Design a protein around this ligand. Structure first.
Ligand code: CLA
Ligand code: CLA
Ligand code: CLA
Ligand code: CLA
Ligand code: CLA
Ligand code: CLA
Ligand code: CLA
Ligand code: CLA
Ligand code: LHG
Ligand code: BCR
Ligand code: SF4
Ligand code: SF4
Ligand code: SF4
Lengths: 139, 68, 741, 80, 141, 74, 160
């Protein structure tokens, strides 16, 4: 909410936000670091993680997690404390990536079964059974 | 009759080694759906493009097997 | 700062790793479970960066592999000199170089290939070579085949010496990492000691051997009464009876009385009227001048004694307002990454080979080089193809540098960082200039096809029709034709007869004519610029978007050589830096094919030909470049259809191997499209059907048969495409020019 | 939006979640496996369809399976 | 009876060509040897030898003898390959000597590969040549 | 004209109206005894019509009108 | 001194280069008929169409099928009128689909709000039609009334 953050010292590039970021949706990543180091933006080029907490905006979620992977791996201080948000041009902010506060590769209680089939993938219905209906054989 | 080291034939149609014989590495005694770990001589297709390696073991159920 | 330090015996010399393939990679060492292991064995055999992570071991492997490559090249050169010594008519060619074709390869008569031994003159049957080795040996002063046999023996000895050095520098005394980091000493010893001393030694050879032997050859003396080059040195009276300034000693060199050396160190400029080549006095003077210049340039960099530059403060001082920080970080880039060095060196060597091609046709350096049109066409085409391949490899290794050796920590706000920051503005404007050049270079041809088809010859882009005269190139030609005596007051003639003057002709054939540029030359030069620009666009787009893009931001973790990221985002097929090299190989094929087609038509129509006794020049095709090289139908009809009448009627003759190679290249080009058009998942399923039929008869192989990978499928397709097209053009060019030249 | 469906032949190796570049997948507890966890795809509207999860699956046929369906501005992965 | 195909000796187009047959080897009369050797074939209107492939005798040398010779040699190659492939299975390290060929076994397979049709008939009648459809990997439908 | 000399007269498919023709293309495509740029028929429906009983242009016109009525009926 | 800066916001994919937005390109792009502050549509379109119709009577008048014929200037006028009409139909259907607010860049921080509606783009299209017809006819009249006007002899001797 309201995204208190300062922007990394970046010289500005051409791979950043286009016109659809202020009209459809844009994304943000905030992360806290105790030292000043150099990172590579998915935008292009290199920028400076300044001391303290950082806020960057990107046009895609994949750019934000490509930054978050660079924040997790390949850094000796091993930054995991990053949060990814989605900002619509209305002003609404949706907090996205660490929803439970824990990374998705670590199991946590309180997460429910999404997309889980209690059947083998070979034990799928034939399409000829599901002709002329909206249902597709992976339902 | 399914025990560790017994040669066994796969009855999963979609498996790479359907109607092929592999050895049993371990059988799990807890209540899981696919307890029989079976290891094969051949390797699966699995891996990225250009990868020279692939997996050669999978979990299977009791009804997905037959002992030779 | 620059010292010699080595490790003694780092790698033992044993044959135990010879029988263990895939030892260099950890993934390749588990054993061949699938046939993808076999192709990965060859794909990653030379990629030393993926083998070891230590830059010292990588540099040691590179240094020792250079010696093996030099040994291979020396075996090749010794084989060429041995073929000149034993299986050639070089002694016959030196007597009558105007009516005997150069041949240096006989064909064994086991099947009907004895017809491939062409009748070339002097009672010798063999393949008419077009490599230009014979003219090179005539310019070197070689008069008999024993001097070629000695050079072949020396090439074998040098190849064995290079093999021993490659074994020595990897298994006995291998240099450390800091022996490679001091590029200051390396560049000083490559400028002064390799280029400078090499050109100084060749200048001395051309003073003492090439000049007297070639002046006696042009004076009309038969080569077996011409004295050997060592009594020219042992007895200076015979050396001083011609070019009589050898009567005085070396003291005018040391008292700076260089002008009395003007009889044998000339700046004549033009071509020799007797032989059609450059004056060897001009070449000896040229080699002496560039030897002095290269030796002077080899004293620029600081190695051990304080004087000199460090190639870093030069880079540190070069910074502007539009860039800011400047070239900081580039010295560490070029001294820690072998791929950036290969990308620079391969680009400059490719452009250098293209310069060599564009220079040796207009200023032929060798006696009777321009007379034999086959040699000139073959060396031009060969050096264009080699140069374009090296430029595309430079794009490749720049892409390999960007994902495997580029470090963003060392590159903040320098030139490379800012290129990555405005790569969209670079690539979009390059895309626009490619589209503009395509429209206003190819739509001119399309418009000319349309108006010539619609019966509108006055609506075309022709010399008679709407003119598009290249006024800048014509102005530059006028500047070069008037350069001798006005802006080069001490040149007897221009650098080449191309820019103006008179027809230089030797025998009955034209050595060189002026090459007038009209609407067709304008239009084909714009197609040259267009195709070069699109090749630049694909290669530079692979370089700049190698690490990341708006599509795939995490593309550096996928690597240089990966097929795709998946069918998502619409389908991310051929996103890698490798696939841009894969497409740039097709576009260099297109570019250099148009270049060599422009050459082979412009020289045949407007330069090459015979001289009538009246004085007019009857060219090979008849000057049809002015009116037919403006249309695609003219290029198809008057160049491809008309000049391939020799390659298809060559059967049952001495050039039938060229017709065979013509059809073979057509086959390989068509064979490429099976790999290029199809995909892996068809062939994996087909091989799955074959595996069951093998399983039915107990024919299951231990190494499981897999289809070729997606990158390997593209690599096989592009290699077959380039091979089939290049073999086709080689066969067409050589069989045309061995019949009309 | 694409459909990422996880089947019951899952060993809970978490390779699909670590291979996923847009946080589509996560691990939920599951009593039917030795690892005690199965993959789930809650925010599958963010799936581009790269099938890196299908690449990393070590089952003989993949327990996680991506079905490319309707295309949105996130499925195309468009920065514009 | 192939009345359109004349013998090359009686054909007056083959005799015009047979003067100018080029020598193929270093033997000077190789063209004359080819001219006399190709005269027993059938020549068309071109003057070139034709091959009749229907298994008849006095034309079995066109296809039947070269065909049977190739069938023997190809059966030799395939049987020695199948024998080596079978022999390297049941010894627990098969990919390494699939990639690096065990020469002393391959020589013994090769030089005893002349009796390939007898061994092929023995394996066919014994049933050890063909794998039953149960014990074989089959793709899904 | 074609039924008089089917072995010499070239069948005309249709006329050419092209704004892009120069004088050379109009002179070149004025063929088969026409005074206009016309295309030579290579589908060979002229032989078909002559064989099935068509003799003059009116029998072809009534067939074209009947086929228009049949298409409207369908 | 960094002459190449960002526009004030570095994470937006653009750079404030001298060519892009320095001092002389912010003006003269903000002072063109598009992006000028006080103009309404059917005046922006009028100015744009007049300039376009005037410039487009250059590759039709001396470059055409009739350029060696006295009907050549008239045919070039008719071709310019036809191209202006096609472009007006394109503008009209682009507006009739439905327009959004135009893209704001570093060079143009303020875009015309009057062109963000379908009614404004209809006025722009009508002004483009009247301007294009007027500019094409004015260029035709200027090229035709001296009947030689040797400035047209230049760039027709080039385009011979
Ligand atoms: C695939 C590799 C390949 C192949 C097979 C050949 C084969 C051929 N070349 Mg070639 N060449 C190539 C690549 C290739 N070259 C490259 C990459 C270059 C650029 C350096 C050249 C430049 C070159 C020239 C300049 C000439 C040949 C010539 C020859 C022909 C005779 C060979 C000979 O003995 O010339 C012997 C020729 C020489 C020794 C003269 C070369 C001296 C050069 C000017 C000095 C180069 C120094 C150094 C190695 C390069 C440093 C680069 C610098 C930017 C740092 C033969 C057709 C010759 C020819 O066409 O004769 C008819 C010829 O004069 N080549
Ligand atoms: C005058 C001194 C001298 C001379 C003759 C050269 C000459 C050469 N060096 Mg070398 N080098 C030198 C000193 C010297 N180097 C110094 C001081 C450094 C250390 C900092 C290097 C480090 C260096 C590296 C690491 C590499 C070279 C390579 C090369 C070869 C270039 C390939 C070529 O075109 O060969 C054509 C020319 C010849 C064959 C003439 C040979 C002349 C003999 C040796 C005398 C060539 C043999 C490359 C190579 O190919 O490795 C073998 C390469 O990998 N050198
Ligand atoms: C690296 C190349 C090189 C080498 C080794 C030679 C070798 C030599 N030169 Mg020299 N020469 C060269 C470059 C070279 N030169 C060039 C570039 C020039 C032009 C400035 C000359 C101009 C030249 C003259 C004018 C003469 C020598 C002569 C000599 C000889 C010295 C005296 C003697 O042995 O008797 C010796 C063979 C002398 C000699 O004996 O010639 C046969 C002689 O008079 N040289
Ligand atoms: C128009 C472009 C331009 C400009 C503005 C500069 C500017 C600079 N150069 Mg130069 N230089 C350039 C192009 C240019 N150079 C080129 C093309 C070359 C390569 C052939 C060099 C090679 C070069 C070297 C070797 C060195 C400089 C250095 C210098 C600095 C002192 C000026 C001087 O004495 O050299 C002016 C030279 C020219 C105008 C030429 C200055 C920062 C020095 C440095 O590092 O300073 C910190 C120095 O060591 N220059
Ligand atoms: C100085 C020259 C130079 C050097 C030494 C390098 C160095 C290397 N390159 Mg290469 N490269 C260059 C020139 C160079 N290249 C050029 C000219 C090209 C343009 C085509 C490229 C394009 C390029 C790409 C695209 C890639 C490399 C890569 C490699 C690496 C490993 C190569 C390997 O093991 O593959 C060995 C493979 C082969 C030898 C197969 C080549 C097959 C060719 C087509 C056949 C030769 C043609 C022949 C005449 C055909 C005759 C047919 C007849 C026999 C029937 C290594 C760093 C690879 C790499 O680093 O991967 C990460 C990589 O993918 N290269
Ligand atoms: C004849 C074959 C052909 C043609 C037409 C094209 C066309 C194109 N290639 Mg290429 N290419 C080809 C084969 C072909 N390629 C193959 C074999 C491969 C190798 C794998 C590729 C891969 C490839 C890549 C890798 C790239 C291209 C790019 C380009 C574009 C260059 C820009 C240009 O010239 O625009 C002008 C267009 C032309 C010259 C085509 C002729 C059109 C005429 C002049 C105009 C006629 C239009 C007509 C009047 C319209 C009215 C008709 C109406 C009924 C619709 C262009 C669209 C590049 C690109 O897009 O970036 C700029 C690029 O990146 N090519
Ligand atoms: C032991 C070796 C062996 C044997 C006996 C077979 C036998 C069979 N293959 Mg073949 N094949 C093999 C190796 C072998 N193949 C290899 C190496 C390849 C890869 C090039 C293939 C790829 C292949 C294809 C693509 C097809 C067959 C087919 C067939 C069948 C018909 C024969 C035929 O079309 O020959 C064709 C043979 C080839 C195209 C290549 C054979 C290469 C040599 C001759 C094999 C023997 C040499 C071996 C490499 C070394 C011997 C071991 C030695 C150390 C002792 C038959 C069941 C066809 C089928 O399914 O029919 C039912 C089919 O479509 N095979
Ligand atoms: C294919 C290119 C082309 C051609 C051949 C011409 C040719 C013509 N233009 Mg035009 N023009 C062009 C592109 C073209 N234009 C473009 C791109 C612009 C925008 C910069 C202009 C802007 C322009 C103006 C401003 C004027 C011309 C004028 C002229 C005429 C005389 C030219 C002159 O004064 O020369 C010397 C001639 C009919 C004049 C005109 O139309 O007056 C009748 C004139 O006033 N044109
Ligand atoms: C010769 C090349 C002309 C280059 C344009 C010079 C202009 C040039 O050198 O600018 C000068 C400027 C140099 O900036 P600085 O003063 O920061 O440079 C300090 C340097 O020493 C590098 O650190 O370069 C740039 O800003 C790059 C912009 C190029 C953007 C223009 C695109 C050029 C490509 C298209 C033009 C092609 C014409 C090709 C004709 C062959
Ligand atoms: C400045 C400048 C520039 C630009 C240039 C150009 C581009 C120009 C153009 C120009 C032009 C392009 C012009 C135009 C003009 C126009 C006009 C002048 C018009 C007018 C018209 C009119 C007036 C008309 C009228 C009418 C009408 C309306 C209707 C009725 C009829 C009439 C005809 C009467 C640049 C960029 C280089 C930059 C620098 C500066
Ligand atoms: S078709 Fe092949 S290259 Fe393209 S996305 Fe699918 S797997 Fe990748
Ligand atoms: S297809 Fe790609 S984005 Fe979608 S779940 Fe799989 S790995 Fe994640
Ligand atoms: S990668 Fe496959 S097996 Fe592993 S946890 Fe994910 S769904 Fe289960």
């Amino acid at each position: 909410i309201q995204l208190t953050g300062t922007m990394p010292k970046f010289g500005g590039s051409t791979g950043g936000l286009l016109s659809a970021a202020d009209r459809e949706e844009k994304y943000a990543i905030t992360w806290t670091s105790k030292t000043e180091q150099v990172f590579e933006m998915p935008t292009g080029g290199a920028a400076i993680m300044n001391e303290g907490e950082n806020l960057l905006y990107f046009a895609r979620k994949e750019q934000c997690l490509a930054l978050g992977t660079q924040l997790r791996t390949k850094f000796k201080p091993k930054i995991e404390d990053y949060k990814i948000y989605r900002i619509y041009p209305t002003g609404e902010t949706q907090y996205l990536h660490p929803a439970d506060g824990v990374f998705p590769e670590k199991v946590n209680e309180g997460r429910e079964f999404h997309g889980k089939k209690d059947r083998n993938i070979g034990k799928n219905p034939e399409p000829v059974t599901l002709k002329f209906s909206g249902k597709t054989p992976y339902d | 009759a399914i025990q560790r080291g017994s040669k066994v034939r796969i009855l999963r149609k979609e498996s790479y080694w359907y109607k092929d014989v592999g050895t049993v590495a371990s059988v799990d005694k807890s209540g899981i759906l696919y307890p029989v770990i079976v290891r094969f001589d051949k390797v699966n297709y699995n891996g990225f493009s250009g990868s020279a390696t692939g997996v050669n073991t999978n979990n299977f159920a009791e009804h997905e097997l037959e002992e030779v | 700062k620059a010292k010699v330090i080595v490790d003694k015996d780092p790698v033992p010399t044993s044959f135990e790793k010879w029988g263990k393939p895939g030892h260099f990679d950890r993934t390749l060492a588990r054993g061949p479970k699938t046939t993808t292991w076999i192709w990965n064995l060859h794909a990653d055999a030379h990629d030393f960066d993926s083998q070891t992570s230590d830059l010292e071991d990588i540099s040691r492997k590179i240094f020792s592999a250079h010696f093996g490559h030099l040994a291979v090249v020396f075996v090749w050169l010794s084989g060429m000199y041995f073929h000149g010594a034993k299986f050639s008519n070089y002694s016959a060619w030196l007597a009558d170089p105007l009516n005997i074709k150069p041949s240096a390869q006989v064909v064994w008569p086991v099947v009907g290939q004895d017809i491939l031994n062409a009748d070339v003159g002097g009672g010798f049957h063999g393949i008419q070579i077009t490599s230009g080795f014979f003219q090179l040996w005539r310019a070197s002063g070689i008069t008999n085949e024993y001097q070629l046999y000695c050079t072949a023996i020396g090439g074998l000895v040098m190849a064995g010496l290079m093999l021993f050095a490659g074994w020595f520098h990897y298994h006995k005394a291998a240099p450390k990492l800091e022996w490679f980091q001091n590029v200051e000493s390396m560049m000083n010893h490559h400028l002064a000691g390799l280029l400078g001393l090499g050109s100084l030694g060749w200048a001395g050879h051309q003073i003492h051997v090439s000049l007297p032997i070639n002046k006696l050859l042009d004076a009309g003396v038969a080569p077996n009464e011409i004295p050997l080059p060592h009594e020219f040195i042992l007895d200076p009276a015979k050396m001083a009876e011609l070019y009589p300034s050898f009567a005085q000693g070396l003291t005018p060199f040391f008292t700076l009385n260089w002008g009395v050396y003007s009889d044998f160190l000339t700046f004549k400029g033009g071509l020799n009227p007797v032989t059609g080549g450059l004056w060897l006095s001009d070449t000896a003077h040229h080699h002496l001048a560039i030897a002095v210049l290269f030796i002077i340039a080899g004293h620029m960099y600081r190695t051990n004694w304080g004087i000199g530059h460090n190639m870093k403060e030069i880079l540190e001082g070069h910074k502007g307002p539009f860039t800011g920080e400047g070239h900081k970080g580039l010295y560490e880039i070029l001294t820690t990454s072998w791929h950036a060095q290969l990308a620079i060196n391969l680009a400059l060597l490719g452009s250098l080979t293209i310069i060599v091609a564009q220079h040796m046709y207009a200023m032929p350096p060798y006696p009777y080089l321009a007379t034999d049109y086959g040699t000139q066409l073959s060396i031009f085409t060969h050096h264009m193809w080699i140069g374009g391949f090296l430029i595309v490899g430079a794009g490749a290794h720049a892409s390999i540098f960007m994902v495997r050796d580029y470090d963003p920590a060392k590159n903040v706000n320098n030139l490379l960082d800012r290129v990555l920051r405005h790569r969209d503005a670079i690539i979009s404007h390059l895309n626009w200039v490619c589209i503009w050049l395509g429209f206003h270079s190819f739509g001119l041809y399309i418009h000319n096809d349309t108006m010539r088809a619609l019966g509108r010859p006055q609506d075309m882009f022709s010399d008679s029709a709407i003119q598009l005269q290249p006024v800048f190139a014509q102005w530059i030609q006028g500047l070069h034709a008037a350069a001798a005596g006005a802006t080069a007051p001490f040149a007897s003639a221009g650098v080449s007869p191309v820019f103006g003057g008179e027809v230089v002709a030797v025998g009955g054939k034209v050595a060189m004519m002026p090459i007038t540029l009209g609407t067709a030359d304008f239009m084909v030069h714009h197609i040259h610029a267009f195709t070069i620009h699109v090749t630049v666009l694909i290669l530079l787009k692979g370089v700049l978007y190698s690490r990341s893009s708006r599509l795939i931001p995490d593309k550096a973790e996928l690597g240089f050589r990966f097929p795709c990221d998946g069918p998502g985002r619409g389908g991310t097929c051929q996103v890698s830096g490798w696939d841009h090299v894969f497409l740039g190989l097709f576009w260099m094929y297109n570019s250099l094919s148009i270049v060599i087609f422009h050459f082979s038509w412009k020289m045949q129509s407007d330069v090459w030909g015979t001289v009538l006794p009246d004085g007019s020049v009857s060219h090979i095709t008849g000057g049809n470049f002015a009116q037919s090289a403006i249309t695609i139908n003219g290029w198809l009809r008057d160049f491809l259809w008309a000049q391939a009448a020799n390659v298809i009627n060559s059967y049952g003759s001495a050039l039938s191997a060229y017709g065979i190679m013509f059809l073979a290249g057509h086959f390989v080009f068509a064979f490429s499209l099976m790999f290029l058009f199809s995909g892996r998942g068809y062939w994996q399923e087909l091989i799955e059907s074959i595996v069951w039929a093998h399983n039915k008869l107990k024919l299951a192989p231990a190494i499981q048969p897999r289809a070729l990978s997606i990158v390997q499928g593209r690599a096989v397709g592009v290699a077959h495409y380039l091979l089939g097209g290049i073999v086709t053009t080689w066969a067409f060019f050589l069989c045309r020019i061995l019949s009309v030249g | 939006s694409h459909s990422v469906k996880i089947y019951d032949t899952c060993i809970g190796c978490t390779q699909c979640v670590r291979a996923c570049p847009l946080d589509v997948l996560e691990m939920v507890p599951w009593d039917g496996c030795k690892a005690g966890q199965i993959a789930s795809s809650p925010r599958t509207e963010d799936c581009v369809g790269c099938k890196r999860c299908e690449t990393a699956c070590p089952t003989d046929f993949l327990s996680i399976r991506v079905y490319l369906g309707a295309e949105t501005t996130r499925s195309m992965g468009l920065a514009y | 009876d192939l009345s359109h195909l004349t013998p090359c000796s009686e054909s007056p187009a083959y005799q015009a060509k047979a003067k100018s047959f080029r020598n193929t080897t270093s033997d000077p009369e190789s063209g004359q040897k080819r001219a006399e050797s190709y005269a027993e074939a059938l020549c068309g209107p071109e003057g070139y030898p034709h091959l009749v492939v229907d298994g008849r005798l006095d034309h079995a040398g066109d296809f039947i003898i070269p065909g049977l010779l190739f069938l023997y040699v190809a059966g030799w190659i395939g049987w020695v390959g199948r024998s080596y492939l079978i022999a390297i299975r049941e010894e627990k390290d098969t990919e390494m000597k699939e990639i690096i060929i065990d020469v002393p076994l391959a020589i013994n397979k090769m030089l005893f590969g002349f009796m390939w049709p007898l061994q092929a008939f023995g394996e066919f009648t014994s049933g050890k040549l063909t794998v039953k459809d149960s014990e074989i990997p089959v793709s899904p439908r | 004209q074609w039924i008089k000399d089917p072995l010499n007269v070239r069948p005309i498919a249709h006329a050419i109206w092209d704004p892009h023709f120069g004088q050379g293309a109009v002179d070149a495509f004025t063929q088969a005894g026409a005074s206009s740029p016309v295309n030579v028929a290579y589908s060979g429906v002229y032989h078909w019509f002559y064989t099935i009983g068509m003799t003059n242009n009116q029998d072809l016109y009534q067939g074209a009108v009947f086929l228009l009525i049949l298409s409207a009926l369908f | 001194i960094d002459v190449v800066n960002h526009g004030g916001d570095p994470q937006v994919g653009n750079l404030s280069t001298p060519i892009n937005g320095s001092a002389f390109t912010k003006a003269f792009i903000n002072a063109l008929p598009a992006y000028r502050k006080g103009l309404s549509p059917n005046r922006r379109g009028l100015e744009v169409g007049m300039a376009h119709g005037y410039l487009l009577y250059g590759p039709f008048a001396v470059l055409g099928p009739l350029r060696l014929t006295e009907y050549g200037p008239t045919a070039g006028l008719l071709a310019t009128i036809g191209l202006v009409s096609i472009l007006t139909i394109c503008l009209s259907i682009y507006g009739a689909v439905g327009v959004s607010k135009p893209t704001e860049t570093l060079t143009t921080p303020e875009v015309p709000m009057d062109l963000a509606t379908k009614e404004g783009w209809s006025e722009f299209a009508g002004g483009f039609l009247l301007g294009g017809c007027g500019g094409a006819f004015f260029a035709f009249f200027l090229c035709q009334t001296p009947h030689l006007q040797p400035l047209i002899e230049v760039a027709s001797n080039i385009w011979s």
